[PDB]
Design a protein around this ligand. Structure first.
Ligand SMILES: CCCC(CCC)[C@H](N)P(=O)(O)O
Ligand SMILES: [Co+2]
Ligand SMILES: [Co+2]
Length: 304
């Protein structure tokens, strides 16, 4: 395998971290290939759940806890810390909140969160590499509590980064907030990609195509599929009570992606950097509630 960039995996990994049995587990947790029967049963559906009041409550809760966990990870980012060390802390932080780390054994993913450095677009596996000055690192958290998943990510700066890293991460965050700001009943899920690409392109960046935002609630990934690029053919119209993510991945170079032989780690084919931000959103009568919002600050961690 020819690596697209300078990054390499740093194995071996620490043995699988156990989750105490008193933590409620999603269905895939103990499937041998980490497949989710509830997802399998609904695969290919276009129908979007309308959440009940109790659902909304469970989504608010798990998304607030997920935010707390991301905030733990953010506080650890600095040169020298390994992504594996972040994942350990995250795993403990989930358990400490009576939650299961959704990524863990999701389709056999080996860790409890995704850590994506520089040219990793998404789904990077926490490993023994210490973060280096000038890196950008995204940590993507999902927790599972009482039958509900809550999903968010942020890109972070490791020490001083260069002007291109600043611009990439700022622009990515802007893309996200501009898409969120359009969300309300009656808007077509496909329009979000128009808004994202218009902003990325204005700033000299491309938009990943192979990964999309998604519905989330009792299932980790379900309807709707939400592409982040212009003129896509997503199906569906936003309605009050819909819950989904928007998670644009934006790149310095070209948009094309490939996967490492680990089956997960998605990288730019050109080996240039990519950044991402993600929130879980609930469509309300008037607009949208950002379930995974930071509560103790108006801003993401990279600004502050
Ligand atoms: C280990 C998996 C975790 C992953 C989804 C996997 C398909 C992310 N939270 P995503 O939905 O890409 O934001
Ligand atoms: Co995520
Ligand atoms: Co997601």
């Amino acid at each position: 395998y020819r690596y697209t960039g300078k990054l390499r995996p740093h194995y071996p990994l620490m043995p699988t971290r156990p989750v105490p049995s008193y933590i409620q587990r999603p269905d895939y947790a103990d499937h041998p290939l980490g497949m989710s029967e509830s997802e399998q049963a609904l695969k290919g559906t276009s129908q979007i759940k309308l959440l009940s009041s109790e659902d909304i409550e469970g989504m608010r809760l798990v998304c607030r806890l997920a935010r707390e966990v991301l905030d733990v990870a953010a506080g650890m980012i600095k040169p020298g810390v390994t992504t594996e060390e972040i994942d350990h802390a995250v795993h403990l932080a989930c358990i400490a909140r009576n939650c299961y780390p959704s990524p863990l054994n999701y389709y056999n993913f080996p860790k409890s969160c995704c850590t994506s450095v520089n040219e990793v677009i998404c789904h990077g596996i926490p490993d023994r590499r210490p973060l280096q000055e000038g890196d950008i690192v995204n940590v993507d958290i999902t927790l599972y509590r009482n039958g509900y998943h809550g999903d968010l990510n942020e890109t972070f700066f490791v020490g001083e980064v260069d002007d291109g890293a600043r611009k990439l991460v700022q622009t990515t965050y802007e893309c996200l907030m501009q898409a969120i700001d359009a969300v309300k009943p009656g808007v077509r899920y496909r329009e979000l990609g128009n808004i994202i690409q218009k902003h990325a392109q204005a700033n000299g960046f491309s938009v990943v195509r192979s990964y999309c935002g998604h519905g989330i609630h009792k299932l980790f990934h379900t309807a709707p599929n939400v592409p982040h690029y212009a003129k896509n053919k997503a199906v569906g119209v936003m309605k009050s009570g819909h819950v989904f993510t928007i998670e644009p991945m934006i790149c310095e170079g070209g948009w094309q992606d490939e996967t490492w032989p680990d089956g997960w780690t998605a990288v730019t084919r050109d080996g240039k950097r990519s950044a991402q931000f993600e929130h879980t959103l609930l469509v309300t009568d008037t607009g949208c509630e950002i379930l995974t919002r930071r509560l103790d600050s108006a801003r993401p961690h990279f600004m502050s």
